[PDB]
């Protein structure tokens, strides 16, 4: 199932979430979060859906909580070292990485990783620059940190972390700066989807092949989407929600790399920008 978590509907920061079953073509509501969270990060580890950081409508959050679909229970988890909205999260080596974001005063170059066996966070080597509105994903055993905003500039840069060497390395940049981006991996390629380039909300996306060191444009989205969520399910890349430059979006579309085409999917129950999405 594809979970769509939190966000902002155009008027309200959301504690609600819903999940999509591609076999029935239907969204169903799920037990809500303890607190509204927009600018959230969401990832799955150990069969649990983690909802990390964000903004509750008044406060930037260091809290996180995890959902077990088997028991239908949300549970608080040990908090982050600092609040992080506009965060990126991903799982590598059995650890949940929380990357960048904004702490309510400062755009963050910091990241930390969570071990569910100890229920503790540990700092990780910092990014080369602060990045909020970042996208993060794992490919080839490396954690990619893509785009974002450094506090002054929307970024086309990206870098990757190797946990075996404890080092970040810069990677070939995007064609355009992208903050409020979504990033996911499909078919061995890293997709960078939508976002905002400093002037314009983007319908464009591009994908990176680490084997050839090449970025390539992909067929664009039907509409611009910044504050998007992206995830992969059933071999398809889902682009969910966001903001098109004028409107917060209840729409989503899915991309088949074999046809290089997008198709609309059943809409969300409510618009959601600053969403988090994951599959479980």
| 10: DSSP letter | S
Could you tell me if residue 163 is left (phi over 0), alpha (psi between -120 and 50 degrees) or otherwise beta?
A: alpha
- Going along the chain from its start, the domains and CATH numbers come out as 2-279 (2.120.10.80)
Strands 26-30 and 158-162, by their bridges, are: unpaired
Please check whether residue 60 is in contact with residue 85, taking contact to mean a CB–CB distance below 8 angstroms. yes
Distances (CA, A) of 134 to 24, 29, 139, 179: 32, 27, 16, 6
Measured CA to CA, the distance from residue 66 to residue 226 in angstroms comes to: 25
Distance, in Å, from the CA atom of 144 to the CA atom of 169, rounded to the nearest integer, reads 10
Asked whether the beta carbons of 255 and 239 are under 8 A apart, the reply is: yes
Both tokens of 18, joined, read 């819903």
Sign of the dihedral defined by the CA atoms of residues 132, 90, 187, 47, in that order: negative
Q: CA-CA distance, 86 to 131, in Å (whole number)? A: 9
Using an 8 Å Cβ cutoff, are 241 and 9 in contact? Answer: no
The answer to whether 230 touches 240, Cβ cutoff 8 Å, is yes
| Whole-number Å distance between alpha carbons of 10 and 277 | 18
Distance CA(101)–CA(275), nearest Å, equals: 14
Place of tokens 């920008």: 273
CA distance 130 to 153: 10
* Alpha carbon 122 to its chain's center: 21
Contact indicator for 203, 221 with CB cutoff of 8 Å: yes
Instruction: List Cβ neighbours of 206 (8 Å cut-off, separation of 6 or more).
Output: 174, 175, 191, 192, 215, 216, 217, 218
Q: What is the DSSP letter of 187?
A: T
Strands 182-186 and 276-279, how do they pair?
A: unpaired
Indicate which technique resolved this structure. X-ray
Consecutive H or E run containing 68: strand 64-68
């Amino acid at each position: 199932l594809l979970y769509a978590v939190g966000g902002y509907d155009g008027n309200t920061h959301l504690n609600s979430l819903e999940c999509y079953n591609p076999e029935t073509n239907e969204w169903s509501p799920v037990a809500p979060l303890s607190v509204p969270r927009s600018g959230i990060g969401v990832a799955v580890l150990g069969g649990l859906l983690y909802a990390v950081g964000g903004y509750d409508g008044n406060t930037h959050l260091n809290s996180l909580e995890c959902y077990n679909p088997e028991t239908n229970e949300w549970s608080p988890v040990a908090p982050l070292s600092v609040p992080r909205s506009g965060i990126g999260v991903a799982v590598l080596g059995g650890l949940l990485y929380a990357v960048g974001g904004y702490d309510g005063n400062t755009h963050l170059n910091s990241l930390e990783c969570y071990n569910p066996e100890t229920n503790e966070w540990s700092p990780v080597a910092p990014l080369s620059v602060p990045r909020s509105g970042i996208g993060v994903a794992v490919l080839g055993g490396l954690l990619y940190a893509v785009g974002g905003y450094d506090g002054n500039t929307h970024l086309n840069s990206l870098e990757c972390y190797n946990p075996e060497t404890n080092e970040w390395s810069p990677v070939a940049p995007l064609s355009v700066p992208r903050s409020g981006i979504g990033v996911a991996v499909l078919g061995g390629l890293l997709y960078a989807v939508g976002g905002y380039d400093g002037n314009t909300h983007l319908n464009s996306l591009e994908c990176y092949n680490p084997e050839t060191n090449e970025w390539s444009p992909v067929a664009p989205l039907s509409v611009p989407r910044s504050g998007i969520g992206v995830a992969v399910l059933g071999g398809l890349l889902y682009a969910v929600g966001g903001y098109d430059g004028n409107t917060h979006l209840n729409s989503l579309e899915c991309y088949n790399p074999e046809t290089n085409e997008w198709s609309p999917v059943a809409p969300l129950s409510v618009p959601r920008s600053g969403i988090g999405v994951a599959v479980l």
